[PDB]
Amino acid sequence: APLPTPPNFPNDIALFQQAYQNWSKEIMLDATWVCSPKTPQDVVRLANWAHEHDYKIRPRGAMAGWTPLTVEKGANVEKVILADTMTHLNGITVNTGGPVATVTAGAGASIEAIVTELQKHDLGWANLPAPGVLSIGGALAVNAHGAALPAVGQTTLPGHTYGSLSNLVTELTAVVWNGTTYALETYQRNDPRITPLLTNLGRCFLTSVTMQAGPNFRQRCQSYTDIPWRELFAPKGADGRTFEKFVAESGGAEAIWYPFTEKPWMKVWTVSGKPPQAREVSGPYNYIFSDNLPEPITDMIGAINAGNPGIAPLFGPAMYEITKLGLAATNANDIWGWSKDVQFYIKATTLRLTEGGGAVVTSRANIATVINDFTEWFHERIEFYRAKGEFPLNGPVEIRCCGLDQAADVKVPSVGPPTISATRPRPDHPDWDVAIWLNVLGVPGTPGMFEFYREMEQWMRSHYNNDDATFRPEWSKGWAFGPDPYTDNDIVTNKMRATYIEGVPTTENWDTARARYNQIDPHRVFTNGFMDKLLP
Ligand SMILES: Cc1cc2nc3c(=O)[nH]c(=O)nc-3n(C[C@H](O)[C@H](O)[C@H](O)COP(=O)(O)OP(=O)(O)OC[C@H]3O[C@@H](n4cnc5c(N)ncnc54)[C@H](O)[C@@H]3O)c2cc1C
Numbered sequence: 001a002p003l004p005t006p007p008n009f010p011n012d013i014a015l016f017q018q019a020y021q022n023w024s025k026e027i028m029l030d031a032t033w034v035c036s037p038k039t040p041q042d043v044v045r046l047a048n049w050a051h052e053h054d055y056k057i058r059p060r061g062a063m064a065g066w067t068p069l070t071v072e073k074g075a076n077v078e079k080v081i082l083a084d085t086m087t088h089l090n091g092i093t094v095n096t097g098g099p100v101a102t103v104t105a106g107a108g109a110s111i112e113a114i115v116t117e118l119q120k121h122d123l124g125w126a127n128l129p130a131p132g133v134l135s136i137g138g139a140l141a142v143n144a145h146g147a148a149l150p151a152v153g154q155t156t157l158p159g160h161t162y163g164s165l166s167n168l169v170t171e172l173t174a175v176v177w178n179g180t181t182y183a184l185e186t187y188q189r190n191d192p193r194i195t196p197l198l199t200n201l202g203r204c205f206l207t208s209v210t211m212q213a214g215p216n217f218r219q220r221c222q223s224y225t226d227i228p229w230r231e232l233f234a235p236k237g238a239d240g241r242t243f244e245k246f247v248a249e250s251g252g253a254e255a256i257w258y259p260f261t262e263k264p265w266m267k268v269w270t271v272s273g274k275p276p277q278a279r280e281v282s283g284p285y286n287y288i289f290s291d292n293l294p295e296p297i298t299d300m301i302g303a304i305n306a307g308n309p310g311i312a313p314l315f316g317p318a319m320y321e322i323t324k325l326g327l328a329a330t331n332a333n334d335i336w337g338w339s340k341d342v343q344f345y346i347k348a349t350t351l352r353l354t355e356g357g358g359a360v361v362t363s364r365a366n367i368a369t370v371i372n373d374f375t376e377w378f379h380e381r382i383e384f385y386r387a388k389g390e391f392p393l394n395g396p397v398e399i400r401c402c403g404l405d406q407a408a409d410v411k412v413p414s415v416g417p418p419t420i421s422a423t424r425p426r427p428d429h430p431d432w433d434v435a436i437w438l439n440v441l442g443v444p445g446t447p448g449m450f451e452f453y454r455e456m457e458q459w460m461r462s463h464y465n466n467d468d469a470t471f472r473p474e475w476s477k478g479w480a481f482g483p484d485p486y487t488d489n490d491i492v493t494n495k496m497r498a499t500y501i502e503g504v505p506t507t508e509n510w511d512t513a514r515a516r517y518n519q520i521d522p523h524r525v526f527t528n529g530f531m532d533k534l535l536p
Pocket residue numbers: 023058059060061062063064065066067069070085107108128129130131133134135136137138139141142143144145146200201202203204205206207346350476
């Protein structure tokens with residue numbers, strides 16, 4: 001069924017109708033209006049047109065995400081235009097000459113494309129998200145990050161950050177109200193106005209960004225599937241092959257622990273000179289068994305989807321075995337290459353899942369305790385539900401750490417970190433210097449799963465709430481589980497604000513960010529109904 005034709009739409013911007021679905025298909029719309037602006041000036045034309053006709057505009061990147069910040073479930077989108085940035089707003093230029101090398105990218109450029117160009121100039125980023133498909137605008141919007149820390153004794157090379165990609169921004173350009181009309185405006189990192197824009201949840205429309213780059217580096221990625229979970233996730237100072245020891249020795253680490261299994265898949269990244277035992281790779285996405293699944297597994301997933309959640313204790317071990325056998329068969333337990341080739345490992349063809357948990361901001365010395373508390377709690381819960389015949393949990397626990405948006409990493413003049421990034425340092429706790437990402441993944445539609453994600457969100461908020469650690473939702477994942485994600489009204493309208501006014505000055509907090517967003521867009525062109533609840 002055709003949507004109403006928009007009134008007097010700019011004649012040279014082609015409009016087409018497409019479906020929209022979020023990653024888990026928990027948001028599904030049969031029809032939306034879409035266009036692909038050719039230049040930043042065309043986004044300006046779209047915004048002024050929208051203002052004049054009471055339409056809304058949303059930037060559309062790779063759609064590799066879950067939140068309702070583009071379109072909401074069940075929403076009337078008759079007066080909404082989605083502006084695909086990836087078709088044309090994708091230019092990339094490396095700039096070598098200043099206090100630091102930089103790269104200027106259209107907001108629709110993919111992060112893989114950006115860092116591929118950086119590699120040609122012997123440059124790179126230290127803390128990359130796992131999927132390269134992401135648009136840079138979409139990555140910045142949520143403080144996108146990887147699993148990287150420096151090893152003990154490792155210095156941060158000039159230009160690099162172990163925080164979010166949002167910490168690397170030296171300048172950006174956005175569509176902004178000037179008092180009479182929307183126009184392009186450019187902000188430098190030393191401008192107080194920029195900090196809410198560095199992580200903006202799509203409340204602002206970025207057309208281009210410039211980001212610092214450091215030197216590229218070679219990196220090893222070793223996999224282990226032979227460490228029992230209680231050994232890996234042990235209390236502080238324990239014997240054996242512990243998570244904290246890997247972080248000390250190597251810096252970068254991520255564990256994937258399938259449900260009802262004994263041994264995680266642990267990945268450890270070490271900066272280098274190739275180790276004799278490692279296999280050199282020349283491209284990303286080196287885990288072929290995880291981008292493509294065979295028939296016995298897809299049959300289990302099919303049977304789960306058909307109403308058999310009791311397959312979970314068979315499915316977890318089956319996924320572990322595909323991983324163990326696949327790593328061995330393809331000789332991928334010990335690989336080495338440029339940063340991007342070992343840090344990009346999730347292809348867009350990966351199994352569609354939905355996520356809970358979030359971030360714990362704390363001191364580096366407290367990593368073992370945070371992880372041990374979470375994994376012991378999780379294990380007790382999953383076994384508790386199994387004993388009652390209930391299987392709310394059929395995907396892995398995933399755990400990784402990175403750094404925060406440290407001022408020391410920024411090599412241009414700067415007014416500070418992103419205002420509302422989950423990676424923003426806490427001024428009241430200068431010793432808090434890591435973010436621990438504690439995620440749980442599950443098959444969409446699983447009975448009891450969102451109830452459990454609510455149970456977990458409540459537990460994390462209450463448990464990680466003291467002088468040693470605090471909890472922040474991961475913007476890009478599920479949160480405000482009511483029990484469905486993004487539906488607990490108290491969390492959306494009260495507790496997210498509370499999180500982002502805690503421990504920070506009233507001159508640079510959640511309310512500062514809201515004020516800036518409304519100054520830039522008082523007509524609320526760059527909003528939807530969910531945005532209006534979260535950021536009034
Ligand atoms: C399987 C998978 C793995 C992932 N792994 C990681 C991970 O390793 N680390 C990590 O940090 N994240 C990860 N993500 C989450 C991902 O970073 C976010 O979902 C991201 O926002 C998606 O970017 P996108 O380009 O697909 O944008 P979209 O999904 O199209 O949009 C996402 C958000 O960005 C905003 N946005 C897009 N373009 C602009 C723009 N030009 N200006 C202003 N706002 C804009 C939108 O309004 C929206 O809020 C993963 C996601 C998936 C699906």
